[PDB]
Amino acid sequence: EVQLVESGGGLVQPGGSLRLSCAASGFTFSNCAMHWVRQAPGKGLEWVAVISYHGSNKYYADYVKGRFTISRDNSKNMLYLQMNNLKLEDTAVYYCAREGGAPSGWALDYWGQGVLVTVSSASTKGPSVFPLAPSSESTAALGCLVKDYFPEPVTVSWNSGSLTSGVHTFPAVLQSSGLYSLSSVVTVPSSSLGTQTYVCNVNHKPSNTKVDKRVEI
Amino acid sequence: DKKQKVHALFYKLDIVPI
Amino acid sequence: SYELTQSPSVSVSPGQPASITCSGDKLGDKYACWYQQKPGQVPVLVIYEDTKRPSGIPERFSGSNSGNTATLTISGVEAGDEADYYCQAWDSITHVVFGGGTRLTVLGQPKASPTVTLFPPSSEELQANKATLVCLISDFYPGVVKVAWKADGSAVNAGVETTTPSKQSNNKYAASSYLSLTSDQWKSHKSYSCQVTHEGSTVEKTVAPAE
């Protein structure tokens, strides 16, 4: 029943600082060593750091060079990574992971869901949200265009999460502008469902943008 | 013995309870 | 640093077991682990201590380590086994090291033509003097498509941005393509079309500004 829930990602400028958090549950946290590992978008896994069950000994990858600090709070079942003097190449999804092999080698037997850390000199930009109305016919596709935002990620739900069947949120395109766009589509019965309201719930946390857009004819 | 040698390395790390 | 050499791409043919190697100097003196990462998912431990399986990992996943080579083998290969597989061990001061990762392709999966959905610009966007045409491409296999845009049947040369294909949950692929115009550009033609080529055949959708 182990769970590892992370928070604390977002956009930061070169030279800036950020703190990541990893909340643990479902196991005796204070008996386990804990790791951080990172993955640049579309790249491979790269170890960051590990900390001992009771927090004395900490070890770091060669690139950290004193800039990051791993810590834990065993009374709150929390694991942290404080990241300072960040560089563009530090952009990555950061995972926390439980250790379960030591002393018989390393084995990262459970991983958190990951949070994205974007290091960039560019400003955050909130998206414009436009309805994608059907036309085209016993089922109909309707959707929302999330246009011109920075950085990733954007999340999209439909009818506040009540609508999940037939929903497809496409990976974003990165235009030459340096801004992202994405679309999210839901396929529904045509005619039969005009008796239903359709609303996409777009959230772009880096820009403080949360928009609910109704999609009608 | 592989396990004995691996353990020697990890005991020096001192990351999990003994 | 250390090493851990993995072939970036491995393909397995129908009926064969998959075999994924991982080499490093002294690797046989260390314990190797193997992680499976399916698209959009977190890594999952499949082998540890060279040969051991966590609970809930089927026995058709086996691991070995001898000489300088660790090997992950998968019998009874299924389409669901397509994923990136990472080996891992440690360097000279016992620090965790990962291999480069191997992407596993399972051959013999059936072809699937793309579904193509094309949306015209919204009235709201046109009121802002912009006009983005959105062409969504889903459920194709294998994952190679070419996307061409047309204005009144003539090839568009500017304003097009298309994603790389990305693996869906069902092992099929999806992509999108955007034609970003101004409202005036949108009104300057009678029709625009998104045309997807896949395995020598094409699917085209058209929209018209004048209703």
Residue C42, Cβ neighbours under 10 Å: how many? 18
Give dist(CA C27, CA A53) in Å, integer: 27
Minimal CA–CA distance to C177: which of A177, A145, A165?
A145
Give dist(CA A39, CA C101) in Å, integer: 12
Residues C32/A104, Cβ–Cβ less than 8 Å = no
Q: Which one of A95, A119, A143 terminates a domain? A: A119
Residue contact B10–A102, C-beta within 8 A: yes
Residues C42/C84, Cβ–Cβ less than 8 Å = no
Give dist(CA C103, CA C83) in Å, integer: 6
Check residue A31 and report its DSSP letter: G
Tokens standing for residue C156: 């568009």
Chain A contact present for B1, CB below 8 A: no
CA distances from A171 to A45, A166, A210 (A): 21, 16, 19
Which residue is associated with the tokens 């490093």?
A: C24
Chain A contact present for C49, CB below 8 A: yes
Check residue B2 and report its DSSP letter: H
| Chains within contact range of chain A (3+ C-beta pairs < 8 Å) | B, C
Nearest Cα residue in chain A from C173: A170
Torsion, Cα of C200, C203, C208, C211 (10° steps) = 170
CA distances from C118 to A183, C12, C39, C149 (A): 12, 36, 26, 11
**What's this structure's resolution in Å?**
2.0
A25 and A85 belong to one structural domain: yes
DSSP character string of B5-18: HHHHHHHHH--S--
Tell me which amino acid residue C113 is. Answer: S
CA distance B8 to chain A (A): 9
A12 and A84 belong to one structural domain: yes
Chain C contact present for B8, CB below 8 A: no
A32 and A65 belong to one structural domain: yes
A21 and A65 belong to one structural domain: yes
Supply angle C-alpha A112, A19, B12, rounded to 5.
70
Residue C4: exposed, middle, or buried by beta-carbon count in 10 A (0-12, 13-18, 19+)? buried
Give dist(CA A172, CA A115) in Å, integer: 17
Q: Residues with Cβ < 8 Å from A156, sequence gap 6 or more?
A: A144, A146, A169, A182, A184, A200, A201, A202, A203
A103 and A9 belong to one structural domain: yes
A106 and A75 belong to one structural domain: yes
Give dist(CA A147, CA A128) in Å, integer: 5
* DSSP H/E element including C125: helix C123-127
Chain A contact present for B8, CB below 8 A: no
Tell me which amino acid residue C153 is. Answer: G
Beta bridge pairs of residue C69: C23, C66
Tokens standing for residue A123: 């400003």
C165 prior amide bond cis, ω within 30:
no
Chain B contact present for A102, CB below 8 A: yes
Beta bridge pairs of residue A125: A150
Nearest Cα residue in chain A from B5: A104
Give dist(CA A188, CA C200) in Å, integer: 31
Obtained via which technique?
X-ray
> Exposed e or buried b for every residue in A172-197, given b needs 16+ CB within 10 A?
bbeeeeebbbbbbbbbbeeeeeeeee
Supply angle C-alpha C166, C63, A110, rounded to 5.
60
Residues C73/C18, Cβ–Cβ less than 8 Å = yes
Which residue is associated with the tokens 């099929």?
A: C172
Give dist(CA A22, CA A4) in Å, integer: 6
Give dist(CA C102, CA C17) in Å, integer: 15
Give dist(CA A82, CA A103) in Å, integer: 26
Q: Which long-range contacts (CB under 8 A, 24 or more apart) does A167-170 make?
A: A168/C136, A168/C138, A168/C174, A170/C136, A170/C163, A170/C174, A170/C175, A170/C176
β strands within chain C, DSSP E: 9-12, 18-23, 33-37, 44-47, 61-66, 69-74, 84-90, 96-98, 102-106, 115-119, 130-140, 146-151, 154-155, 160-162, 166-167, 173-182, 192-198, 201-207
Q: Which one of A70, A101, A119 terminates a domain? A: A119
Tokens standing for residue C31: 């314990």
Q: Which one of A119, A141, A173 terminates a domain? A: A119
A134 and A169 belong to one structural domain: yes
Give dist(CA C19, CA C32) in Å, integer: 15
C142 prior amide bond cis, ω within 30:
yes
- CB-closest option in A46, A135, A145 to C98: A46
Report how far Cα A53 is from the mean position of its chain's Cα atoms: 27
Residues C61/C54, Cβ–Cβ less than 8 Å = no
A63 and A105 belong to one structural domain: yes
Chain A contact present for B17, CB below 8 A: yes
Check residue A216 and report its DSSP letter: -
Residue C208, Cβ neighbours under 10 Å: how many? 12
Domain range for A15 is 3-119
Give dist(CA A169, CA A183) in Å, integer: 6
Residue C146, Cβ neighbours under 10 Å: how many? 10
Residue C139: exposed, middle, or buried by beta-carbon count in 10 A (0-12, 13-18, 19+)? middle
Residues C35/C86, Cβ–Cβ less than 8 Å = yes
Residue contact B16–A52, C-beta within 8 A: yes
Share in percent of chain C as helix, strand, coil (round to 5): 10, 50, 45
CA distances from B11 to A52, A99, B7, C6 (A): 12, 15, 6, 29
Give dist(CA A105, CA A124) in Å, integer: 42
The CATH number of the domain holding residue A150 is 2.60.40.10
Check residue A97 and report its DSSP letter: E
Q: Residues with Cβ < 8 Å from C122, sequence gap 6 or more?
A: A130, A131, A132, A133, A145
Residues C185/C120, Cβ–Cβ less than 8 Å = no
Please give the CATH topology (third level) of the domain spanning C115-207: Immunoglobulin-like (2.60.40)
Same topology between domain C5-106 and domain C115-207: yes
A104 and A159 belong to one structural domain: no
Nearest Cα residue in chain C from B11: C94
Tokens standing for residue C52: 């051991």
Q: Residues with Cβ < 8 Å from C143, sequence gap 6 or more?
A: C165, C167, C173
- Residues in B touching A53 (Cβ below 8 Å): 15-17
Length of chain B (residues): 18
Report how far Cα A52 is from the mean position of its chain's Cα atoms: 26
Element counts in chain C: helices (H) and strands (E): 2, 18
**Phi, psi (5° rounding) for residue C33?**
-120, 160
Provide the residue ranges of all domains of chain C, joining segments of one domain with +: 5-106, 115-207
A85 and A135 belong to one structural domain: no
Q: Residues with Cβ < 8 Å from C35, sequence gap 6 or more?
A: A45, A108, C43, C44, C45, C46, C85, C86, C87, C88
Minimal CA–CA distance to A18: which of A69, A78, A83?
A83
Share in percent of chain A as helix, strand, coil (round to 5): 5, 50, 45
CA distance B9 to chain C (A): 7
Chain B contact present for C31, CB below 8 A: yes
A205 and A178 belong to one structural domain: yes
Chain B contact present for A108, CB below 8 A: no
Q: Which CATH number fits domain C5-106: 1.10.10.10, 2.130.10.10, 2.60.40.10, 3.30.565.10?
A: 2.60.40.10
Residue contact A31–B6, C-beta within 8 A: no
Torsion, Cα of A183, A187, A190, A193 (10° steps) = -100
A113 and A147 belong to one structural domain: no
Minimal CA–CA distance to C142: which of C11, C8, C2, C1?
C11
Give dist(CA C33, CA A65) in Å, integer: 26
Residue C106: exposed, middle, or buried by beta-carbon count in 10 A (0-12, 13-18, 19+)? buried
- Split into its structural domains, chain A has a count of 2
